[PDB]
Homo-oligomer: A and B are copies of this chain.
Amino acid sequence: TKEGVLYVGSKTKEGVVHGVATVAEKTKEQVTNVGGAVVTGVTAVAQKTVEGAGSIAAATGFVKK
């Protein structure tokens, strides 16, 4: 009934990858928030599947009071 194919094929000679960098000097509040996965690579694949009537996905930095 439901079918799916994902095909990734890659060739490279040289690859340099810098993923997620968070840097702070003298700061008070700094937030990095990722609701999914973090994937970093010469070849990078992220696949997510959710099956269900009432799926809730929520992602927020910060809540005060």
User: How many copies of this protein are present in the complex?
Assistant: 10
Interface of A is mostly: strand
Contact of A25 among B24, B31, B41, B46 (CB under 8 A): B24
Query: Would B42 and A39 count as touching, CB distance under 8 A?
Result: no
- Is A34 touching B33 in the complex (CB atoms < 8 A)? yes
A64 touches which of B20, B44, B46, B64 (Cβ 8 Å): B64
User: A residues 46-65 with Cβ under 8 Å of B?
Assistant: 46-65
Nearest CB to that of A65 among chain B residues?
B65
Q: Given the complex, which residues of B lie within 8 Å of A26, measured CB to CB?
A: 25-27
CB-nearest residue of chain B relative to A50?
A: B50
Contact between chains at A40 and B17 (CB < 8 Å): yes
